[PDB]
């Protein structure tokens, strides 16, 4: 397994200082969409990498400098109820809600959002324009998956909207206090996120508060198509592929099989 | 360049030619690596000995080295015309860097001769408004390496404002040179013809202008 | 399959400084290492000094120690086996002693006892240390010639004249023509001009099909002449 | 010097011919223990070191039909051809790496394998059969 | 003057795709979760990861054409219904 | 003459030991490709390609223990016995098949690779080692 090591890598190119192992480093397989979770991060520069930048329909896959902290909490004190269904068999349901009720939520620190998409926003320029403007408004619509940051945390699965996140313009100085930006989530227990259409995962309940803080290291935006070169370009979050999660763990990687049959002419004679 | 080489080398179409290089004990051929460079004067060169006798890459067989205890030889077999040029020869270690030689001209004869092509021509209508006069005699398509011009007003000598190049080798394997002869517009005016005359060593170019013509 | 390319030509004064770039493309450019040699006619060729643009190494010699800096970038790769770096190099306290032609190599190998040894030579860089000026030249159409009355051949040129600084290119009708071009090289006059001509023979059934059109281009005076050779011929030999 | 697995990968084929038995020694045994039973994930990691055994023993088998047999540097009896790699000594072994060698004998590879299994073991075997008699 | 000599254990290796191993990390039988995401059948981590850099060697990658991306792929999903599998059905909750 | 792989099953086996290398060569990697992963299907094939090699390396073990090692014709020091095949030269190597070979040898050759794994290399490196001090 060959290793690229410089700093700056466009993921499609020649890398210049290449190391081999065996074994890779460590990639926690994390399920989430808009937002990559717990990823690695990146070296020195905000990376943005594509298939093909010109073409609209290929995602953006974005890799962060500065982790970006976030906090979900389901704030429901719940309880589970084990009711008996056939003779092995035990079907774990939500119990009644023990002390008051409120919409589980992530929160993202409003100071380090803003850093980071200023950050963001010079790495993209170099692609678009100096001195130019870019917006980034929320999703479009469609799949509850692809429109919301869907992932997991102790056993629930947070649909979070993260439309509080992306209503922004940008001079080429600034853009156009508040401690924190909290995000309203729902949350959804039964998935049909198989591929196999032919089944769906029940989530058992989770006795308790949960509350579960993470590193966030990316970002999948698509752009808006169209004739839209003099006039500004829009950045919405995306995904549904699961392989673009993958893409930001696995780009500085490739298989390599030995060949170590080599021939080559020097002077000598037998018998 | 303490470095010392052969003087000045001709030779013969396809025969054989040896250079030499040498010098003191202290830049001695007797524990150091030895290399040749063909050298045209204001072009690409080309490494063609290196290190010891072991050519180059490319380089045909007809080139050959040797090193003794007190010299480094050269030696090429069935001299072409394009081998007529200037070597040159480096001393150097592992770690040393190049050392050059004194240089030595080599000069393949036996060939074709050349007549020359020798063409003389007058300022024009801008430089008379210039207020200057330059007469021009291009040389080119010459074998030897020598020629000697003469400028005659009104086919009496002239001295003064009187330029003449250096030999030149044409990328065709011959040579060109050329002259250059400055006057003034008195003078233009009060004379009938103009000459310039290239000696060659087996003949003689001449071309005659007019101001009136 | 190296194709180097060094600088451009500039014209300077004496104890000023001028820098020569030297671009590589086609190979490894930190693989081998980086020779520099001039060619003065006060005192023959001289080995400058080499450059190792892997391990950050140079050897000059000790006349050089001093006026001599020389510079290298990072190798660009292109492929996996191609990369194009560059060389710099910067002189200074120039004199009269340092006119002529200067050349940046490629090393030999990459191990053994000759590895420095200058074997893709550039295509040059010529550099003339005067105090003078800058002149631009006056460039002369030349009157067709008879070079075989039998076959029926003329020769028609363009005339370059009186210019100081570095000596200039010419192309026919924008480069589409190369057979038959023939270019001088440049004189010396008692005040330091440097005059040149150049000529091409064409048919001289090659008057009513063809135009020919002589381009001049002197880069440190920064100045081009696009001249049209009258084919209206003056020999008595070519008129019959 | 060593400088590990694949230390010499750039390095002049002659250099890298001072790592062989490193580069040999890491690819054959890459043990992993299968101890624990799980069903279907080990047919995919067991068909890949399967496979790799396969692979081996095709290399030793190519090296075994030669008169080249020994897991070391050696040498035959097939003369170069100028067609190949039109280059002379210590141009190659100290201005080359192994992976630009293979790309410009790739043309020409092909048929050199077959010029070292048959001009030699098919004729070299035969000579040493009706040589050994005296 | 010159025949041609085979030289086994030369540093060549031409891009392809195989099989792929996975990690246990170590710390799985601390753990007693009974089963994480691959604690079922990935073998434990080696001491010391051979993390060797190699010198002059310029490689040309591509993240957006790797087979890397394809395995595992296709191993979270066959890790997602191996996982699902013995577990308990709900279909009577479909009332 | 070649004819391919099996080539002179029928010729003389003089005219068959000229194919050695063929038959070497297509008998170690009939190599499938088995990177789709279907379930109880491989298990079969791979078990197939498994006992390939096992009986591959049975017969190196026994190229190995004897004197004989190199994947070639190779000669030993234990003497033909006239009882086994009562023939001349050339009555052998130029009007019989190794398929008729094997055939009268299946007789008396479980005792021919004894007494070349006893007879020789129990002795015969055991004279080595008490014959190489001096
Ligand atoms: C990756 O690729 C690069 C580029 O392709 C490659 O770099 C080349 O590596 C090879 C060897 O692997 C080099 O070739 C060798 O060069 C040796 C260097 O010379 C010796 O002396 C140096 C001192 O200079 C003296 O004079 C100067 C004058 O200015 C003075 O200042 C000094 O004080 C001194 O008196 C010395 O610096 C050098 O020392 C070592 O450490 C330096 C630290 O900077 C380092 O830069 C050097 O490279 C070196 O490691 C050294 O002692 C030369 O001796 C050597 O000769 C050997 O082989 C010959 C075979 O004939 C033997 O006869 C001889 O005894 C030696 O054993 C050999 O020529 C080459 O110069 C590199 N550069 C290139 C081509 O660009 C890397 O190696 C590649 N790496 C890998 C892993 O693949
Ligand atoms: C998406 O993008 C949008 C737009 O970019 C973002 O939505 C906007 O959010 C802001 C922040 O909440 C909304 O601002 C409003 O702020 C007013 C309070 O400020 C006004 O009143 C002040 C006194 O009450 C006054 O001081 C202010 O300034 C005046 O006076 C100063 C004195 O010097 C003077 O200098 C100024 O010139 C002014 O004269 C100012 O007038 C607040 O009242 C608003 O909330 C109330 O009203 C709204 C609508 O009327 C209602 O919806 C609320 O429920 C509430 O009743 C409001 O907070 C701004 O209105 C938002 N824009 C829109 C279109 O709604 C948004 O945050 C981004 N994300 C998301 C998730 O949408
Ligand atoms: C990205 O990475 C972050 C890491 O920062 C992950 O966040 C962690 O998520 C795990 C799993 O949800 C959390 O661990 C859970 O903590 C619960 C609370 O335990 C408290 O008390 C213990 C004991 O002192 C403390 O160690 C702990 O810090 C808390 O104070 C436990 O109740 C949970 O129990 C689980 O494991 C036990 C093991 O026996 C089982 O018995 C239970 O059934 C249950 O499975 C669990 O241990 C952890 O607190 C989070 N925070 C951290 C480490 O900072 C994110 O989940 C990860 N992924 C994403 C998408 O964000
Ligand atoms: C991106 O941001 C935009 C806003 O910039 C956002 O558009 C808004 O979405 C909300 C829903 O999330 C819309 O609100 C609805 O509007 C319809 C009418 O258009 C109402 O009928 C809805 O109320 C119904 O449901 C309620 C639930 O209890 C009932 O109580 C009620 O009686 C109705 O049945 C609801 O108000 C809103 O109209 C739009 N438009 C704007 C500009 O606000 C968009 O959803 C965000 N996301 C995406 C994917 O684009
Ligand atoms: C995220 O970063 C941006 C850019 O730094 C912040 O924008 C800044 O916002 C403040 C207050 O909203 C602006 O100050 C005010 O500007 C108005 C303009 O008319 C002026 O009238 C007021 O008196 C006051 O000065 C500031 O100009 C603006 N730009 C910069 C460069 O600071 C934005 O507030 C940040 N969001 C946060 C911190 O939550
Ligand atoms: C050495 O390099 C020279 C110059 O490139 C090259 O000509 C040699 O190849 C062969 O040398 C033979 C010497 O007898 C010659 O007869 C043969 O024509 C020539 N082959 C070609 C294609 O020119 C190189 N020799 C070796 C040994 O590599
Ligand atoms: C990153 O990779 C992209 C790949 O598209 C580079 O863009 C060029 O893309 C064309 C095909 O559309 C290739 O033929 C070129 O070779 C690519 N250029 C280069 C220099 O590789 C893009 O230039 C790369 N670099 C950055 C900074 O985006
Ligand atoms: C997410 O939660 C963590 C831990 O609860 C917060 O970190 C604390 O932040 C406060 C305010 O700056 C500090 O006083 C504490 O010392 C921090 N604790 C630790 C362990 O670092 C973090 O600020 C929260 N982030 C958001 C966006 O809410
Ligand atoms: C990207 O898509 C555009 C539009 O189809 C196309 O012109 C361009 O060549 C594509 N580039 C790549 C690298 O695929
Ligand atoms: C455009 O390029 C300039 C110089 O490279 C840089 O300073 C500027 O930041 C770039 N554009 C913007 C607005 O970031
Ligand atoms: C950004 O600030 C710089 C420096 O003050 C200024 O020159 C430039 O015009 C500003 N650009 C915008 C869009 O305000
Ligand atoms: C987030 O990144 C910081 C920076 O190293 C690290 O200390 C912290 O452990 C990370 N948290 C997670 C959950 O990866
Ligand atoms: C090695 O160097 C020589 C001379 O500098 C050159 O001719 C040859 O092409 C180089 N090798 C490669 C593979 O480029
Ligand atoms: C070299 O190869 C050519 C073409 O493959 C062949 O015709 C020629 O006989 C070969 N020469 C030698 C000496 O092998
Ligand atoms: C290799 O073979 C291909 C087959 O067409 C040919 O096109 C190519 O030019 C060959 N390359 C060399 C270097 O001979
Ligand atoms: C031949 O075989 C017979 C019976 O197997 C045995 O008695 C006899 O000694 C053998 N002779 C030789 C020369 O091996
Ligand atoms: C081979 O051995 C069997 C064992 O009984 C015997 O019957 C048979 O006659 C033998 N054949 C020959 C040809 O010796």
């Known amino acids: 397994i060959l290793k690229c090591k410089d700093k700056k890598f466009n993921g499609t190119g020649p890398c210049p200082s290449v190391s081999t192992v065996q074994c890779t480093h460590g990639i926690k397989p994390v399920v989430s969409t808009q937002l990559l979770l717990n990823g690695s991060l990146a070296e020195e520069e905000v990376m943005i990498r594509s298939e093909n930048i010109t073409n609209n329909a290929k995602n953006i896959l974005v890799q962060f400098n500065t982790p970006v902290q976030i906090n979900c909490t389901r704030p429901n004190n719940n309880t589970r109820k084990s009711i008996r269904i056939g003779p092995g068999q035990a079907f774990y349901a939500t119990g009644d809600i023990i002390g008051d009720i409120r919409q589980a939520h992530c929160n993202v620190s409003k100071a380090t959002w803003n850093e980071t998409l200023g950050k963001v926003v010079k790495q993209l320029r170099k692609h678009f324009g100096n001195n130019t403007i870019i917006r980034f408004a929320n999703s479009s619509g469609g799949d509850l998956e692809v429109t919301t940051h869907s992932f997991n945390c102790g056993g629930e699965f947070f649909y979070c909207n993260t439309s509080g996140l992306f209503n922004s313009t940008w001079i080429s100085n600034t853009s156009v206090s508040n401690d924190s930006i909290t995000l309203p989530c729902r949350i959804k227990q039964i998935i049909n996120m198989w591929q196999r259409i032919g089944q769906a995962m029940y989530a058992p309940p989770i006795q308790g508060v949960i509350r579960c803080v993470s590193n966030i290291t990316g970002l999948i935006l698509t752009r808006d198509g169209g004739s839209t070169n003099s006039t500004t370009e829009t950045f919405r979050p995306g995904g549904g592929d699961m392989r673009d999660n993958w893409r930001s763990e696995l780009y500085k990687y490739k298989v390599v099989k030995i060949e170590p049959l080599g021939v080559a002419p020097t002077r000598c004679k037998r018998r | 360049s303490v470095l010392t080489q052969s003087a000045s080398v001709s030779g013969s179409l396809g025969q054989s030619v040896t250079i030499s290089c040498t010098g003191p004990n202290s830049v001695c051929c007797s524990h150091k690596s030895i290399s040749w460079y063909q050298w045209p004067p204001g072009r690409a060169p080309t490494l063609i000995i290196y290190e010891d006798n072991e050519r180059a890459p490319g380089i045909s067989p007809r080139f050959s080295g040797y090193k003794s205890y007190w010299s480094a030889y050269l030696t090429i077999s069935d001299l072409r015309p394009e081998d007529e040029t200037t070597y040159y020869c480096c001393s150097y270690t592992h770690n040393s860097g190049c050392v050059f030689g004194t240089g030595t001209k080599v000069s393949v004869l036996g060939q074709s001769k050349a007549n020359p092509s020798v063409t003389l021509f007058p300022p024009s209508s801008e430089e008379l408004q210039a207020n200057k006069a330059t007469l021009v005699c291009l040389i080119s398509d010459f074998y030897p390496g020598a020629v000697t011009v003469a400028w005659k007003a009104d086919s009496s000598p002239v001295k003064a404002g009187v330029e003449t190049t250096t030999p030149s080798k044409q990328s065709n394997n011959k040579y060109a040179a050329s002259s250059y002869l400055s006057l003034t517009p008195e003078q233009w005016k009060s004379h009938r013809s103009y000459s310039c005359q290239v000696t060659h060593e087996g003949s003689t170019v001449e071309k005659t202008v007019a101001p009136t013509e | 399959e190296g194709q180097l390319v060094q600088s451009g030509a500039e014209l300077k004064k004496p104890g000023a400084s001028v820098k020569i770039s030297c671009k590589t493309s086609?190979?490894?450019?930190?693989?081998?290492?980086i020779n520099w040699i001039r060619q003065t006619a006060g005192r023959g060729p001289e080995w400058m000094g080499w450059?190792?643009?892997?391990?950050?190494?140079?050897?000059?010699?000790?006349?050089?120690?001093?006026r001599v800096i020389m510079t290298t970038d990072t190798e660009v790769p292109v492929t996996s086996f191609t990369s194009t770096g560059a060389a710099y190099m910067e002189i200074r306290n120039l004199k009269f002693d340092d006119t002529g032609t200067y050349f940046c190599?490629?090393?030999?190998?990459?191990?053994?006892?000759?590895?420095?040894?200058?074997?893709?030579w550039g295509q040059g860089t010529l550099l003339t240390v005067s105090s003078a000026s800058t002149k631009g030249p006056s460039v002369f159409p030349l009157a067709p010639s008879s070079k075989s009355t039998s076959g029926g051949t003329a020769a028609l040129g363009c005339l370059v004249k009186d210019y100081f600084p570095e000596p200039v290119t010419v192309s026919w009708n924008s480069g589409a023509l190369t057979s038959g071009v023939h270019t001088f090289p440049a004189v010396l006059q008692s005040s330091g001009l440097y005059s040149l001509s150049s000529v091409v023979t064409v048919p001289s059934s090659s008057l009513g099909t063809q135009t020919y059109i002589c381009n001049v281009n002197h880069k440190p005076s920064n100045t081009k002449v696009d001249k049209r050779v009258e084919p209206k011929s003056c020999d008595k030999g070519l008129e019959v | 010097v060593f400088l590990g697995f694949l230390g010499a990968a750039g390095s002049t084929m002659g250099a890298a011919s001072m790592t062989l038995t490193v580069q040999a020694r890491n690819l054959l045994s890459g043990n992993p223990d299968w101890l624990p039973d799980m069903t279907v994930w080990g047919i995919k990691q067991l068909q890949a070191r399967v496979l790799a055994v396969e692979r081996y023993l095709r290399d030793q088998q190519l090296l075994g039909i030669w008169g080249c047999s020994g897991k070391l540097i050696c040498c035959t009896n097939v003369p170069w051809n100028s067609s190949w790699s039109n280059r002379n000594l210590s141009e190659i072994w100290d201005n080359m790496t192994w992976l630009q060698w293979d790309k410009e004998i790739s043309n020409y590879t092909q048929i050199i394998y077959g010029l070292l299994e048959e001009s030699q073991n098919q004729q070299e075997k035969n000579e040493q059969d009706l040589l050994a008699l005296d | 003057n010159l025949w041609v000599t085979v030289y086994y254990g030369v540093p060549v290796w031409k891009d392809a795709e195989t099989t792929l191993f996975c990690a246990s990390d170590a710390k799985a039988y601390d753990t007693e979760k009974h089963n994480v995401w691959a604690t079922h059948a990935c073998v434990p981590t080696d001491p010391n990861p051979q993390e060797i850099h190699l010198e002059n060697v310029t490689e040309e990658f591509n993240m957006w054409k790797n087979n890397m991306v394809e395995q595992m792929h296709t191993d979270i999903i066959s890790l997602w219904d191996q996982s699902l599998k013995p577990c308990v059905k709900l279909t009577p909750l479909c009332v | 003459v070649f004819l391919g792989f099996l080539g002179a099953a029928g010729s003389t086996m003089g005219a068959a030991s000229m194919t050695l290398t063929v038959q070497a060569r297509n008998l170690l990697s009939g190599n499938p490709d088995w990177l789709p992963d279907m379930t109880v299907w491989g298990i079969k094939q791979l078990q197939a390609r498994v006992l390939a090699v096992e009986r591959y390396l049975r017969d190196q073990q026994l190229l190995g223990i004897w004197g004989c090692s190199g994947k070639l014709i190779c000669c030993t020091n234990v003497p033909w016995n006239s009882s086994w095949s009562n023939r001349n030269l050339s009555e052998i190597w130029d009007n019989m098949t190794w398929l008729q070979w094997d055939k009268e040898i299946s007789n008396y050759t479980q005792i021919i690779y004894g007494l070349l794994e006893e007879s020789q290399n129990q002795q015969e490196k055991n004279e080595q080692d008490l014959l190489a001090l001096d």
């Open positions: 086609g190979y490894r450019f930190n693989f081998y290492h």
């Open positions: 450059i190792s643009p892997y391990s950050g190494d140079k050897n000059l010699a000790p006349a050089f120690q001093d």
């Open positions: 190599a490629k090393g030999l190998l990459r191990d053994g006892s000759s590895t420095w040894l200058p074997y893709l």
